[PDB]
Paper text:
This leads to expression of a [name] protein with antiviral activity against viruses, such as [name]-1, that recruit cyclophilins. Here we characterise the molecular details of Cyclophilin-Capsid interactions focusing on [name] proteins from Macaca Fascicularis.
In a previous study comparison of the crystal structure of the N terminal capsid domain of [name]-2 with [name]-1 indicated that the [name]-2 CypA binding loop is shorter by a single alanine residue at the position equivalent to [name]-1 CA88. To test this we solved the structure of [name]-2 with an alanine inserted at position 88. These hydrogen bond interactions are not affected by the E143K mutation, explaining why [name]-2 with an inserted A88 is no longer affected by the charge change. Position CA88 is therefore a critical determinant of sensitivity even to mutations that are over 20 Å away as in the E143K Mafa TRIMCyp2 allele.
Numbering used by the authors:
A (entry chain A), B (entry chain B): 2 to 146
């Protein structure tokens, strides 16, 4: 999550209580139907950095990471297909529009993620887009497990 | 739940995201299959006070609340019958053994609940015994809804 203190938006991590709650939620029936709303509530206000921490937390469930990974690449490829990258201009020292991999938090830092989410000039809610990609992945975990 | 810092055992509330997760879980299929797994998992480590915080969140489902009330009542009564307590509640100074409603958090404080759970000479798992009564209620709500 993110918090504003003196014209400065800053990262605050998910508390251990919450990460711990999510792990429990997941291990309870092993991707039971409950993980989907559970995840939507526990990831409210999150940056991609924070969602990747949530997933790292259950990473010993390799079979679900793989289902989730597959959809992330599926949705990130689609994203790139629907967000070309325009032929400049873009000024050295100025932050790129995000690609499907910046949204997933693979090629971007938490700080860049906060800059897209809260910039006044067409923010891009990268954390909320990513959550949509994970949800679909979670829904598949539930149907294939 | 309970944090152990400084040889003194202290209440740590459920994180707000945990509580919202509970609600989403409940309101997802209106007391659907998930609430029981969801309950078990998110209620881990709680005092009855916390279990009651969870319940106050979904308090506007009076119908399920009522089903839960019957159960707590059935169970709190059999607790009292199976722990006679002699004529006539003397008492003393040292904290009373829990009655059916100290377990339900009605006639007790979190400090008192933490006191039963952690005292070294015969602890009493009040949070968990109470979890057990809320699951039977929830199991009933799923059957009844």
């Amino acid at each position: 999550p993110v918090q504003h203190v003196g014209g400065t938006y800053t990262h605050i991590p998910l508390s251990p209580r919450t990460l711990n709650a999510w792990v429990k939620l997941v291990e309870e029936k092993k991707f039971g139907a409950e993980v989907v709303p559970g995840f939507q509530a526990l990831s409210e206000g999150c940056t991609p950095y924070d969602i990747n921490q949530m997933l790292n937390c259950v990473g010993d469930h390799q079979a679900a990471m793989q289902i989730i990974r597959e959809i992330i690449n599926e949705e990130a490829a689609e994203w790139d297909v629907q967000h070309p990258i325009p032929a400049g201009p873009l000024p050295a020292g100025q932050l790129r529009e995000p690609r499907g991999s910046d949204i997933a938090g693979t090629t971007s830092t938490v700080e860049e993620q906060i800059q897209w989410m809260f910039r006044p000039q067409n923010p891009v809610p990268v954390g909320n887009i990513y959550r949509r990609w994970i949800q679909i992945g979670l829904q598949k975990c539930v149907r294939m497990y």
